[PDB]
Each structure stands twice: as C-alpha cells, then as structure tokens.
Amino acid sequence: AHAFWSTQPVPQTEDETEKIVFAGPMDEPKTVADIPEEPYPIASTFEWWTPNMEAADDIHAIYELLRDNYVEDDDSMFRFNYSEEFLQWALCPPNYIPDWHVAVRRKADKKLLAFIAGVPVTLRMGTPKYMKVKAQEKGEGEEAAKYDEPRHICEINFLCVHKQLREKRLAPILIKEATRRVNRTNVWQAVYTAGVLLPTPYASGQYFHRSLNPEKLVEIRFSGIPAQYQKFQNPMAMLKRNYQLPSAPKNSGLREMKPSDVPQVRRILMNYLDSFDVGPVFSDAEISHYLLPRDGVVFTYVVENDKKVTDFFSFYRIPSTVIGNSNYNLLNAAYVHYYAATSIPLHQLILDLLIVAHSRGFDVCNMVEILDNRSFVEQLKFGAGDGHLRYYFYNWAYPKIKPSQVALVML
Numbered sequence: 001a002h003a004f005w006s007t008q009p010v011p012q013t014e015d016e017t018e019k020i021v022f023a024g025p026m027d028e029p030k031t032v033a034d035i036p037e038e039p040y041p042i043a044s045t046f047e048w049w050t051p052n053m054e055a056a057d058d059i060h061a062i063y064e065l066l067r068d069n070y071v072e073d074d075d076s077m078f079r080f081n082y083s084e085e086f087l088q089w090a091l092c093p094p095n096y097i098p099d100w101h102v103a104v105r106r107k108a109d110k111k112l113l114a115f116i117a118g119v120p121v122t123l124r125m126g127t128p129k130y131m132k133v134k135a136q137e138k139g140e141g142e143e144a145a146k147y148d149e150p151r152h153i154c155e156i157n158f159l160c161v162h163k164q165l166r167e168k169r170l171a172p173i174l175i176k177e178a179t180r181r182v183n184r185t186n187v188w189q190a191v192y193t194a195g196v197l198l199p200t201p202y203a204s205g206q207y208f209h210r211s212l213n214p215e216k217l218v219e220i221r222f223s224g225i226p227a228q229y230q231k232f233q234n235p236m237a238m239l240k241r242n243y244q245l246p247s248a249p250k251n252s253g254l255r256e257m258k259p260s261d262v263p264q265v266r267r268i269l270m271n272y273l274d275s276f277d278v279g280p281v282f283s284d285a286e287i288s289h290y291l292l293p294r295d296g297v298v299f300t301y302v303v304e305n306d307k308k309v310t311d312f313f314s315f316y317r318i319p320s321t322v323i324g325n326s327n328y329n330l331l332n333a334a335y336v337h338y339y340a341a342t343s344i345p346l347h348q349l350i351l352d353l354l355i356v357a358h359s360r361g362f363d364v365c366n367m368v369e370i371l372d373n374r375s376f377v378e379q380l381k382f383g384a385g386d387g388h389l390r391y392y393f394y395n396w397a398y399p400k401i402k403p404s405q406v407a408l409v410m411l
C-alpha cells in the first residue's frame with residue numbers, strides 16, 4: 001500500500017495501465033476557483049519559500065541542497081552535482097512561472113530543507129499510433145483523437161528532501177503544494193521521470209554509458225575490467241585502446257550552433273520528434289534556450305553544408321560527486337540531449353558527439369534508450385547500466401508504450 005499515491009489521480013497498478021486504450025484525464029474536472037488559494041498547512045517551525053531564480057544567492061541555496069541531498073546511486077558512490085548555471089538554465093525556460101518553484105525552509109535560520117520544481121512544457125500526449133489503429137478497427141476514432149492537440153502542462157523535477165528530514169512524510173506535502181500552485185494556473189497534468197518504481201510508469205528505458213576515459217571510470221569504480229580482459233597481459237592497455245577516439249570530428253560541415261540557426265534546427269527537430277507518440281513542441285525561444293551553447297552546461301553542433309543545417313546534435317553536462325574515492329572529486333558526464341539527422345547515418349552524427357565530448361574532457365556519455373538511441377548502441381560501444389529511467393503522467397490515463405516511442409529528454 002502507498003499511503004500517499006493511493007490518494008492521487010494516477011493509475012494504481014500495472015494491470016490497470018496495461019488496459020488503458022485512450023489518452024485522457026483521470027480526475028474530476030475542476031476549476032481554478034475550486035482550488036484553495038492558501039498554501040497547504042505545514043508545521044509551525046517551517047515556512048513555504050518561492051526562490052527567485054535570477055538571484056545568485058537563492059540559486060546557490062538550491063544548489064547546496066541538491067549537491068548534498070539529491071540523487072545518489074544505490075551504492076552511495078556518486079551523487080549528482082548540478083552546477084548553479086545548469087540550475088538557472090533548467091528552472092528558467094521561456095514563460096516559466098516562478099510560483100511553480102516550491103521550497104520548504106526552517107522558520108528560525110531559513111535553512112533550506114526541501115525543494116520541488118515545475119516548468120512549463122508543451123507536450124504531445126494523445127493516444128499512441130498503434131492504439132489509434134485498434135480504434136479505427138473498432139469505430140472508436142473520435143474518442144481516441146480527442147486529446148491529440150499539444151497540451152501546455154507542467155514538467156516536475158528536482159524533488160529533494162534534506163537527509164535529516166527523510167521518512168517524515170514531507171515529500172507528499174511538497175507534491176500537494178506544487179500541484180496546488182500548478183492547478184491555480186489552470187494546469188491539470190504533469191509529466192515526470194524517476195529512477196524508482198512508482199504507480200505507475202507509462203514507459204521505462206534502460207540507461208546506457210559510453211566510456212570516454214576508461215582509466216578514471218575503473219579507478220572510481222564506475223566501471224569494472226571485465227573478466228575477459230584478464231586473458232590479456234595488460235588489461236588497462238586493451239581497455240584504453242578499445243575506447244580511443246579521433247581527436248577531431250569526422251563530418252566536414254560541423255560547427256557550434258549560432259542564433260541564426262534556430263529556425264532551421266526547430267524545423268528539423270520538430271519533423272523528427274513528431275514521429276514519436278510522446279514528445280515536446282518547441283517555439284523559437286524554447287529552441288534558443290534549450291539548445292544554444294552555454295559554457296559548461298549545454299553544447300550543440302550543427303552540420304551545415306551549402307549554408308543549410310542538415311543535421312544537429314546536442315549534449316549537456318552533469319558532474320557527479322565521487323563520494324567514496326579520495327583521488328577524484330568528480331565524474332564529468334555528458335548526456336545526449338536532442339539531435340536530428342537528415343544527411344548522414346545517426347551512428348555517424350553521434351560519433352562526432354563522442355569525439356567532441358571526449359576532447360572537452362568528459363569521462364562518459366550517458367543516455368536513456370528513448371528516441372533512436374538504440375540505433376547506435378553497439379557500433380558506438382555503449383553499454384547498458386543497471387538503471388531504469390521511468391516516465392510518468394500525473395492525472396492522465398495513458399497506454400504502456402515502448403521507450404523508443406518517447407521523445408522527451410528530462411534534465
């Protein structure tokens with residue numbers, strides 16, 4: 001039994017989810033007028049805070065909370081170390097609602113103890129294609145197509161309770177209050193990902209890794225030398241040789257994205273994403289924001305030939321604190337962001353991703369098996385990890401789909 005999630009407009013079981021045929025809301029339809037205007041009650045030693053995201057010092061406080069209390073691997077070897085410039089980038093996209101950033105502070109000292117954030121996103125989340133088929137088959141098309149239009153919803157992320165406050169039922173309260181602030185602005189759906197199993201995922205994809213610096217990865221125990229490498233004189237030599245990469249990209253035509261590129265990238269990106277059942281729709285401003293290069297944060301390259309952007313790829317940076325080594329403070333990880341290829345094979349576009357990432361000193365390239373990410377796994381030498389990233393909707397009945405039907409990257 002889930003004493004909190006049992007009370008919420010989400011499907012409660014797998015056998016419920018594997019049964020839903022059409023997209024649509026779970027809940028009673030409500031109105032902003034229905035929604036309490038007062039923040040949810042919390043204990044008197046605490047207060048609600050709305051951090052200002054254009055203030056270095058609020059940003060810093062959130063940074064400090066996540067640096068010390070955000071996601072850890074299960075072995076307590078690594079913890080995410082999202083930088084401050086990263087957090088402002090992710091929390092302040094175009095038309096962000098400050099009010100959707102929810103913080104709990106100790107009244108006395110104003111020590112930050114909990115956080116959750118929401119950001120707007122325009123998401124295509126109607127009935128998946130295979131299920132539109134079975135609908136036509138059955139004369140049920142109009143019902144299946146009812147919620148096809150892109151919805152302006154909320155993207156939830158960065159939920160985090162201080163280590164000292166764990167298992168005190170605080171996280172439900174943060175979620176109820178975030179829900180409140182979002183329902184207040186006439187939004188009734190949310191989307192979120194988590195490494196854990198909650199009721200109830202609509203897709204689930206394995207994690208994948210590609211060693212850029214195998215010596216460090218073994219030293220910090222991110223990676224092991226596989227038994228098959230012992231049959232060699234010099235295990236680390238063979239490993240290193242095995243993952244080596246060219247020093248410069250292979251595609252002539254390749255450079256960083258510039259502002260003048262935005263409409264072409266938007267265009268090639270949307271054509272690509274539109275073939276997925278679940279995926280975002282981006283304005284010019286959203287493409288500028290989520291893809292223009294920003295130092296230490298997001299790195300984006302286009303293939304231009306004949307003054308035409310035929311292809312682009314993007315990645316972003318999240319260091320993890322190495323918790324249990326002493327020699328290395330940090331794992332320097334590149335995450336495959338969005339991309340599109342029209343003129344060249346995808347494995348060929350992404351090789352140049354590895355090449356750049358490695359040349360800029362990243363230790364590893366990470367990804368989930370969404371988009372067409374599966375298409376380059378073997379030839380670029382990615383390995384599956386032990387994670388599962390799960391994708392969820394709040395207040396939205398949706399069929400179980402394959403992770404390769406998802407085109408939403410969550411930071």
Ligand SMILES: CCCCCCCCCCCCCC(=O)SCCNC(=O)CCNC(=O)[C@H](O)C(C)(C)COP(=O)(O)OP(=O)(O)OC[C@H]1O[C@@H](n2cnc3c(N)ncnc32)[C@H](O)[C@@H]1OP(=O)(O)O
Nearest residue numbers: 002003004005070071158159160161166167169170171190
């Ligand atoms: C319309 C808009 C709607 C807006 C809202 C949309 C929904 C958003 C939903 C959230 C999307 C966030 C996506 C991300 O950011 S995922 C990243 C999550 N963050 C971390 O893992 C950081 C390290 N961990 C922690 O800070 C805490 O352990 C957290 C905060 C995760 C739980 O704190 P704590 O350990 O002190 O526990 P509790 O006693 O306070 O609370 C216990 C209840 O919490 C349920 N629980 C445990 N983990 C998660 C989890 N990751 N998502 C949702 N629920 C979770 C759990 O099943 C139990 O419920 P029930 O089993 O009793 O029913």
Ligand SMILES: Cc1nn(C)c(C)c1NS(=O)(=O)c1c(Cl)cc(-c2ccc(N3CCNCC3)nc2)cc1Cl
Nearest residue numbers: 071072073078079080193194195320385387410411
């Ligand atoms: C190096 C390292 N550092 N950390 C902190 C870990 C867990 C690893 N090892 S890992 O590489 O193998 C790995 C990686 Cl990168 C990531 C995730 C993961 C979990 C949750 C999540 N959501 C993303 C959206 N917001 C909510 C959280 N995304 C990703 C799990 C694994 Cl297990």
